[PDB]
């Protein structure tokens, strides 16, 4: 039942709306990634809200959790698309925004792109299952909270704990075995922790970009600028931190 829902609520394809006839320029490429961010967020909000047990969380916590976790959530799914599609050779941000080494450079994001490409690579190196992925992605929504807890921190802990048990559940079967089960869970929880440093590098990047957006001609859509100037700082100043397994 858990998996039927995750499989059922999983978002479809989201295009960034990039003009691929115009030259790659920092401004263009980043305005596109931002718009894509605005579009994908609309879908993350719907998905999250349709997550089993999600409604147990307090209304403000529901929103807060989405607002702190979107970067890692989008980065993780983006790595999956790059994987199932381009076998991790390039970053499949959208069907109309697939970065090559040249785009990775002309974006002043080469490094972060290397790390995300590296993540996508892990889905391969580890042979991640579509279902392990659905579960791992679900748990990333419950992977970053304020240091002083949320309004109803007891519902989040319940919720989060349950998602950890489903992850172990979907490996403890044919998706693990012999001496795998223990090793399999150590590597998946290790792969999950890996998305966090990558998310933080992008948080600082996007934040700096937003402060000087008017000068590099890159513009951030409504929700992006608001969430980047209201929520992301709380993360960057240490008020909200990721939950690490290791």
Ligand X SMILES: C[C@]12CCC(=O)C[C@H]1CC[C@@H]1[C@@H]2CC[C@]2(C)[C@@H](O)CC[C@@H]12
Q: Which stretch binds ligand X (CB under 6 A): 67-75, 142-150, 165-173, 175-183?
A: 67-75
Task: Decide whether 66 or 170 has the Cβ nearer to ligand X.
Answer: 66
Residue 98, H or E segment? strand 97-99
CB 210 within 8 A of CB 229: yes
Selected from 6, 29, 31, 37, the binder of ligand X by CB under 6 A is 37
Burial class (CB in 10 A: 0-12, 13-18, 19+), 109: buried
Q: Which stretch binds ligand X (CB under 6 A): 4-12, 27-35, 141-149, 185-193?
A: 27-35
Task: Decide whether 87 or 204 has the Cβ nearer to ligand X.
Answer: 204
Task: Decide whether 108 or 175 has the Cβ nearer to ligand X.
Answer: 108
Q: Which stretch binds ligand X (CB under 6 A): 35-43, 126-134, 141-149, 150-158?
A: 35-43
CB 195 within 8 A of CB 76: yes
Contact map string, positions 146 to 185, toward ligand X, x by CB under 6 A: ----------------------------------------
CA distances from 88 to 34, 93, 99, 125 (A): 22, 12, 11, 11
Q: Does 36 bind ligand X (CB under 6 A)?
A: yes
Place of tokens 């931002």: 34
CA distances from 92 to 96, 165, 178, 185 (A): 9, 30, 35, 27
CB 89 within 8 A of CB 8: no
Q: What are phi and psi of 78, to 5 degrees?
A: -65, -35
Q: Was 81 annotated as part of a binding site?
A: yes
Q: Was 206 annotated as part of a binding site?
A: yes
Max CA pair span of the chain:
57
Position with the least CB separation from ligand X = 37
Beta partners for 240?
146
| Listed residue (44, 55, 52) closest to 2, CA to CA | 52
Contact map string, positions 74 to 103, toward ligand X, x by CB under 6 A: xx--x--------------x----------
Selected from 88, 196, 206, 231, the binder of ligand X by CB under 6 A is 206
Q: Which stretch binds ligand X (CB under 6 A): 18-26, 123-131, 141-149, 199-207?
A: 199-207
Give CA–CA dist 34/226, Å, rounded.
Answer: 12
Name the minimum Å distance from CB 160 to ligand X.
22
Q: Was 84 annotated as part of a binding site?
A: no
Site of interaction with ligand X (CB under 6 A): 30, 33-34, 36-37, 40, 71, 74-75, 78, 93, 202, 205-206, 209
């Amino acid at each position: 039942i858990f998996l039927n829902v995750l499989e059922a609520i999983e978002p479809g394809v989201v295009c960034a709306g990039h003009d691929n006839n115009q030259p790659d320029s920092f401004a263009a490429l980043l305005s596109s990634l931002n718009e894509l961010g605005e579009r994908q967020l609309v879908h993350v909000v719907k998905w999250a809200k349709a997550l089993p047990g999600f409604r147990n969380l307090h209304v403000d916590d529901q929103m807060a959790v989405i607002q702190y976790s979107w970067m890692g959530l989008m980065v993780f799914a983006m790595g999956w698309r790059s994987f199932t599609n381009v076998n991790s050779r390039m970053l499949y941000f959208a069907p109309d925004l697939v970065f090559n080494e040249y785009r990775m450079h002309k974006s002043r994001m080469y490094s972060q792109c290397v790390r995300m490409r590296h993540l996508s690579q892990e889905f391969g190196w580890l042979q991640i299952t579509p279902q392990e992925f659905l579960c791992m992605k679900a748990l990333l929504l419950f992977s970053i909270i304020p240091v002083d807890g949320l309004k109803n921190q007891k519902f989040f802990d319940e919720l989060r704990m349950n998602y950890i048990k489903e992850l172990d559940r979907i490996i403890a079967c044919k998706r693990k075995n012999p001496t795998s089960c223990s090793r399999r869970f150590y590597q998946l929880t290790k792969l999950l922790d890996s998305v966090q440093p990558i998310a933080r590098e992008l948080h600082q990047f996007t934040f700096d970009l937003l402060i000087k957006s008017h000068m590099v001609s890159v513009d951030f859509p409504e929700m992006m600028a608001e969430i980047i100037s209201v929520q992301v700082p709380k993360i960057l100043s240490g008020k909200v931190k990721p939950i690490y397994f290791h």
